[PDB]
C-alpha cells in the first residue's frame, strides 16, 4: 500500500536510480501515465491525471485465495512548490467533479509529493489531481522554467509484505529437484485455509512444502521434477508502472516580449521583400 | 570617402538559376552562428569543475540575466543545426550537388557533419547531471573495442581510465576550443570550394 | 539571361546581388522560430550528488539514435563500431560510386534513389531507443 | 508520452503546405509566372 513506502523508505519515494520504491514489492509491470499541461501560468489550479489502466474484467486471488476485484494506488512527484489547490480554489465539476480521494504528503511538508493512500477500485483507472502552481514572485526560492514530474502507479496486490514475507499473490515454486507424488491440499478451519503440499524427491532427502490458498495447481504426482521450481500457477495479475513528464511554469511576461519580437520580425521582414525585391524597377527599366 | 581603395567596386555581379531548398546550407550555418554567440556568452558564467559545473548551469538559469534564454536557445539551435544539416544533406544528395567536380565539397561536407555531431556530444555532457554524465560514461568505452590503440583512443578522450575530473576538462576544451576551430576551417574550405555552379535545368 | 563568353561548363544566369536581401528574411525567420521555441519550451537540470546511481534509459541526442540503436543491437564487438564508422566513411565514397551521369539531371537513376530512400528508412527504423518498439516489431 | 510529439510532428509537415499555400496565393494576387 502507498502507506507502506512512506514507512519503509520515509525520506524519499524514489531511489537514486529513478525507479520508485514500489517495485520492491509489486514486481509485475503494467502501464502508467501522467497528464499535465505543457505549461501553466504561476498560481493556477490545473489538472494532473494519473492513469492506471487495466480492463475491469479479471480477478486476483485475495488473501483468502478467492477471486476479487482490482484496487489502484500511486505516488506523484510534482516539482518544488506545487501542491494541491486549497479546497476553495478547486472549480466545480471542472476540478472538483473529477476524482475525490485523499492526497497524503510523503512526509511532513512535502506538499508536492503526494501518496494516493486511498486505494479506489475500478472507479479510479483515472484519478485526477487538482494541483496549484507556485509563484516565483511571492516566493523568491521558486523560479520559472521547465521542471520534472514523476509517477509510480500500481494496481493488484503485492508479492511481498513490509513484514519481509511474501503474499500468496505470486507463484510458490518447489523446494526440491524431484518428482512429487501428491497434493496435500486440505483446507484448514476458520480464519485461514492453507493448501499444503506433499513433495517427495525421496532421493535421500524426501521433502514436502506449503503452498497458500489462491494460486491454482497444474501438475503434481508421477512427474514434476524440475528443480524446486514452478509451484503450479501464477495468480499475480497486476503491477507497477512509472511515467515521467515535465511542465513549464510560464511567465506570461516572457511570452509577451517573444510575441512582441516575433511581430517586429514579421513586420521587419515585410518591409524587406516590399522594398528590396518588389522595388526592382530601376534596372528593371533597362 | 574612397580613400579605401585597396582595389574595390565591380563586386556587384554573379546571377542565380532555380532552387528553393538551397537554403539548408545557410540555415544550418545560421544555427551555428547562433551557437557561437550564445555558446560564447555562457563561457562567462559556466564553471567547469566536477564540483562547480552543475551549479554554474543553475546559476545561468535562475540567477543570471536571460541566462535561461541564452541557454535555452543554445539547446534548441543545436538540435536545429544538426536537424538542418541532415536536410541539407538530403537537398544535396537529391539534387546531385557533389557534382562531377564538387566531390571535395562533399567530403569536407561529411567531415563537417562529424565535427557537428561531436559538438553536441561533448556539450551534452557539460551541465554534468545524469543524462549527460552517464551518456559520456557510456560512449567512452565505445572506442575500446578497436584493437591496436582503441584503448589509447579512449584513454585520450576521457583523459583517464574512468569518467571524471579530466573527462570534463578535455570535453570542455574540445567543445569550446578545438571543435570550434575545426568547423571554422572546414566551413572555410567548404565555402571557398564554392567557385563552381550547382544544378541542372532544361 | 545567359549568353556566350568565357563560355562552357557551369556558371551564372539571372538574379545577381539582391537575393542577398531575402536572406535577411531567412535569417530572421530562422532566429524567430528558435526564439519562440526556447520560450514556450525551455531547458532544465539534474544531479551532481551520486554518480554511483545509474539512471536507466540513456537518451543521447536524437540523432545518435540510429547509430545507438545499432551499437546496442548487434553484440558489441567492433562490428558496430566498424558499422557506425561506415556511415560517414561510406558516405565519403558516394561521389565516387553514384558518379557517372552528365547530360541528364539527378532524379533519373533509381540504383541510387531506391538505395537512398531505402537507407533513410533503415536509418529512421533504427531511430529507436531503450527497449523502445525494439529492432524487431518492424 | 508519444502523443505529445505525434501531434508535434503533424504540425511541422502541414504548416509547410499552409505556408506554401499562402505564398502561392500571395503571388497569384499580384501575378505568378503562368508560363
Amino acid at each position: 500500500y502507498p502507506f507502506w513506502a512512506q514507512q519503509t523508505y520515509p525520506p524519499t519515494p524514489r531511489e537514486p536510480t529513478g525507479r520508485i520504491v514500489c517495485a520492491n514489492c509489486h514486481l509485475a509491470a503494467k502501464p502508467a501515465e501522467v497528464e499535465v499541461p505543457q505549461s501553466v501560468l504561476p498560481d493556477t489550479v490545473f489538472k494532473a491525471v494519473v492513469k492506471i489502466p487495466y480492463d475491469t474484467k479479471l480477478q486476483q486471488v485475495a488473501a483468502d485465495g478467492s477471486k476479487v476485484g482490482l484496487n489502484v494506488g500511486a505516488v506523484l512527484m510534482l516539482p518544488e512548490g506545487f501542491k494541491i489547490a486549497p479546497e476553495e480554489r478547486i472549480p466545480e465539476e471542472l476540478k472538483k467533479e473529477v476524482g475525490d480521494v485523499y492526497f497524503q504528503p510523503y512526509k511532513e511538508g512535502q506538499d508536492n509529493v503526494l501518496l494516493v493512500g486511498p486505494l479506489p477500485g475500478e472507479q479510479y483507472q483515472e484519478i485526477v489531481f487538482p494541483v496549484l502552481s507556485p509563484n516565483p514572485t511571492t516566493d523568491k526560492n521558486i523560479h520559472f522554467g521547465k521542471y520534472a514530474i514523476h509517477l509510480g502507479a500500481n494496481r493488484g496486490r503485492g508479492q511481498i509484505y513490509p513484514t519481509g514475507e511474501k503474499s500468496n499473490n505470486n507463484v510458490f515454486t518447489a523446494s526440491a529437484t524431484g518428482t512429487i507424488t501428491k497434493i496435500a491440499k486440505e483446507e484448514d478451519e476458520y480464519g485461514n485455509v492453507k493448501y499444503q503440499v506433499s513433495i517427495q524427491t525421496d532421493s535421500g532427502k524426501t521433502v514436502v512444502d506449503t503452498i497458500p490458498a489462491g494460486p491454482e495447481l497444474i501438475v503434481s504426482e508421477g512427474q514434476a521434477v524440475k528443480a524446486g521450481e514452478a509451484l503450479t500457477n501464477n495468480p499475480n495479475v497486476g503491477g507497477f508502472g512509472q511515467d515521467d513528464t515535465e511542465i513549464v511554469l510560464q511567465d506570461p511576461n516572457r511570452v509577451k516580449w517573444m510575441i512582441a519580437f516575433i511581430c517586429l520580425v514579421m513586420l521587419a521582414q515585410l518591409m524587406l521583400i516590399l522594398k528590396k525585391k518588389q522595388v526592382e524597377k530601376v534596372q528593371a527599366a533597362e | 570617402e574612397i580613400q579605401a581603395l585597396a582595389d574595390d567596386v565591380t563586386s556587384k555581379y554573379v546571377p542565380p538559376h532555380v532552387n528553393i531548398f538551397y537554403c539548408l546550407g545557410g540555415i544550418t550555418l545560421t544555427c551555428f552562428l547562433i551557437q557561437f554567440a550564445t555558446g560564447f556568452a555562457m563561457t562567462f558564467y559556466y564553471k567547469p569543475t566536477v564540483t562547480e559545473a552543475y551549479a554554474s548551469v543553475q546559476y545561468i538559469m535562475n540567477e543570471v540575466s536571460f541566462g535561461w534564454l541564452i541557454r535555452s536557445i543554445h539547446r534548441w539551435s543545436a538540435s536545429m543545426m544538426v536537424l538542418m544539416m541532415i536536410l541539407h544533406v538530403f537537398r544535396v544528395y537529391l539534387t546531385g550537388g557533389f557534382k562531377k567536380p564538387r566531390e571535395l565539397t562533399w567530403i569536407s561536407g561529411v567531415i563537417l557533419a562529424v565535427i557537428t555531431v561531436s559538438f553536441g556530444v561533448t556539450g551534452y555532457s557539460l551541465p554534468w547531471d545524469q543524462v549527460g554524465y552517464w551518456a559520456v560514461k557510456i560512449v567512452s568505452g565505445v572506442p575500446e573495442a578497436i584493437p591496436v590503440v582503441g584503448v589509447l583512443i579512449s584513454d585520450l578522450l576521457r583523459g583517464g581510465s574512468s569518467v571524471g575530473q579530466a573527462t570534463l576538462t578535455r570535453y570542455y576544451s574540445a567543445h569550446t576550443f578545438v571543435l570550434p576551430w575545426l568547423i571554422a576551417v572546414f566551413m572555410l574550405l567548404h565555402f571557398l570550394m564554392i567557385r563552381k555552379q550547382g544544378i541542372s535545368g532544361p | 539571361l545567359a549568353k556566350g563568353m568565357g563560355h562552357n561548363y557551369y556558371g551564372e544566369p539571372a538574379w545577381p546581388n539582391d537575393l542577398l536581401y531575402v536572406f535577411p528574411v531567412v535569417i530572421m525567420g530562422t532566429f524567430a522560430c528558435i526564439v519562440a521555441l526556447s520560450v514556450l519550451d525551455p531547458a532544465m537540470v539534474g544531479e551532481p550528488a551520486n554518480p554511483f546511481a545509474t539512471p536507466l534509459e540513456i537518451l543521447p541526442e536524437w540523432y545518435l539514435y540510429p547509430v545507438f540503436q545499432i551499437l546496442r543491437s548487434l553484440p558489441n564487438k567492433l562490428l558496430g563500431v566498424l558499422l557506425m564508422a561506415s556511415v560517414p566513411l561510406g558516405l565519403i565514397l558516394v561521389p565516387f560510386i553514384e558518379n557517372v551521369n552528365k547530360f541528364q539531371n539527378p532524379f533519373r537513376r533509381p540504383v541510387a534513389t531506391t538505395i537512398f530512400l531505402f537507407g533513410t528508412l533503415v536509418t529512421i527504423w533504427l531511430g529507436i531507443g531503450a527497449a523502445l518498439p525494439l529492432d524487431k516489431t518492424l | 508520452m508519444t502523443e505529445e510529439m505525434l501531434y508535434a510532428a503533424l504540425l511541422s509537415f502541414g504548416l509547410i503546405f499552409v505556408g506554401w499555400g499562402l505564398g502561392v496565393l500571395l503571388l497569384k494576387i499580384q501575378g505568378a509566372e503562368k508560363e
Binding site: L41, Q269, K277 | - | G29 | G19, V24, L27
Partner: peptide, 27 residues
Amino acid sequence: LVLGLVFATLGGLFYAAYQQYKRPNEL
C-alpha cells in the same frame, strides 16, 4: 490561454517561411 497564443505564435511564426514561399518573381 496566453500559452495558446504562444504556440500559435510558433506555429503562426513559421510564416517566416511563408515569405520565401512567395519570393519568386521576375528579373
